[PDB]
Each structure stands twice: as structure tokens, then as C-alpha cells.
Design a protein around this ligand. Structure first.
Ligand code: KEU
Length: 200
């Protein structure tokens, strides 16, 4: 399968995907990396791996549909089969999500359905959980609410900050996101017609 990764930042998740798709027997190759933000490290990581990049600045579009269409143009240009959102921070429009249904994955730093949204670690700390984790899910229109592929629990330590908790959870993310990508790229895991995840 030909894979695009969308990013908005550091790209540590991207890096783990690059590394895993180049291990032997991979069913995926990363063919394009797209950022909505210039000068982010994830772009350097892609370029250092010999993977083309684009910057599509979301602020230059009137609305989300037009921005998403510009993304979609590039995904077509690269004959992309599967899209991975790896620290991508733009909510995608209905029609984009519908088009990519069953073929777009996201990594989220909590055990969904808890702590939906972009500040999951701040929520986990306020709430006082001792166990949090991360989730790979198919992307649905409702944010952080698509069908769950894999999850991994990560302990919260007394005295954690957002930084330390974030780092511990990233280590688990770098395990489950490549694993989930491989599952979907091999056709082992599919989104079924009934809208539920199917293991073949
Ligand atoms: N329709 C749709 N459904 C999805 O499930 C997507 C996957 C969501 C990724 C999650 C997420 C949750 C909220 C946002 C968000 O509010 N973005 C704002 C911009 C926020 C900002 O600049 O800080 C904005 O205006 O877009 C961005 C990302 C995430 O919480 O899991 C995390 F971790 F990535 F942040 C998606 N892109 N589109």
C-alpha cells in the first residue's frame, strides 16, 4: 500500500512509521509527507528519509473543504492508498473523511473514549487517572470517535508533568501506530460495511 502521512509538528510518530515500513515484509511504503505548517521538524525527518514533502498552509484557504481539496489533489498526485495522521492538528471536513473512509488512521494519546481532543495529557492529569495510554483509530467525521484498531495502556507516574507523561505515551505510540498501519495495509484489519472493525 502507498501511504501518505499528514503532520503538523515534530514528527516522532512519522519517524517510527518510516522505520517500520522499511523493515522486511512491510505491506506499506511512505510516499509523501504533508504538513499544514512550514519549518516543522517532521518535514526534515521526511526529507532525510528521501521522502517528498509538501507544505499546504491551512491559513491560505477560505474554508476547510478547499484546504482538504488541496490535500486531496496531492494524495491523488501520489496515487495514495492509505493516509496516516501523525500529530496532524487540523480537523478534516465531512467529504474528505467520507472519501478516505476505511483508509485513514490517526494516533491519539489517550485510551479512547476517554480524553478526546488535542490536550489529552492535560485532561488525564486534571482527572487523576493512574493509567492512560494511546489509541490508533480509523478517522470518522466525529473527532477522535472513529473505530478503534489498537490501544496500549501507559502508567501515569505521581509527579508527572505534561512533558514526562507525553514522552512515556509517545514510546507506546511508536509501537502501536506502525503495527496498526501494517494491519490495515495488509488487509488484515478492515473497516466493515456495517461500520465496525473487521479482522480477516
Ligand atoms: N473529521 C475529523 N475527525 C478526526 O477524528 C481527525 C483526527 C483528529 C486528531 C485529534 C484532534 C482534536 C482536535 C483538533 C483541533 O481542535 N484542531 C483545531 C486547531 C487546534 C490548534 O491549532 O490547536 C482546528 O480548527 O482544526 C485537532 C486534532 C487528536 O486529538 O487525536 C490529536 F491527538 F491529534 F490532537 C480529523 N482530522 N478530522
Amino acid at each position: 500500500a502507498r501511504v501518505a502521512v499528514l503532520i503538523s509538528g515534530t514528527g516522532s510518530n512519522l519517524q517510527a512509521l518510516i522505520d517500520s515500513t522499511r523493515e522486511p515484509n512491510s505491506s506499506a511504503q511512505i510516499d509523501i509527507v504533508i504538513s499544514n505548517k512550514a519549518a516543522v521538524a517532521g518535514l526534515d525527518k521526511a526529507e532525510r528519509a528521501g521522502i517528498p514533502t509538501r507544505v499546504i498552509n491551512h491559513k491560505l484557504y477560505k474554508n476547510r473543504v478547499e484546504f482538504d481539496s488541496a490535500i486531496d489533489l496531492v494524495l491523488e498526485e501520489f496515487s495514495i492508498d492509505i493516509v496516516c495522521l501523525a500529530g496532524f492538528m487540523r480537523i478534516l471536513s465531512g467529504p474528505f473523511v467520507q472519501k478516505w473512509n476505511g483508509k485513514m488512521l490517526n494516533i491519539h494519546p489517550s485510551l479512547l473514549p476517554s480524553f478526546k481532543g488535542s490536550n489529552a495529557h492535560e485532561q488525564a492529569l486534571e482527572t487523576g487517572v493512574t493509567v492512560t495510554g494511546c489509541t490508533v483509530h480509523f478517522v470518522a467525521e466525529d473527532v477522535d470517535a472513529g473505530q478503534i484498531i489498537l490501544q496500549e495502556a501507559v502508567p501515569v507516574k505521581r509527579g508527572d508533568t505534561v512533558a514526562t507523561l507525553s514522552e512515556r505515551v509517545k514510546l507506546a505510540e511508536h509501537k502501536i501506530f506502525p503495527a496498526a498501519l501494517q494491519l490495515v495495509a495488509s488487509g488484515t484489519v478492515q473497516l466493515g460495511e456495517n461500520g465496525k472493525i473487521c479482522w480477516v
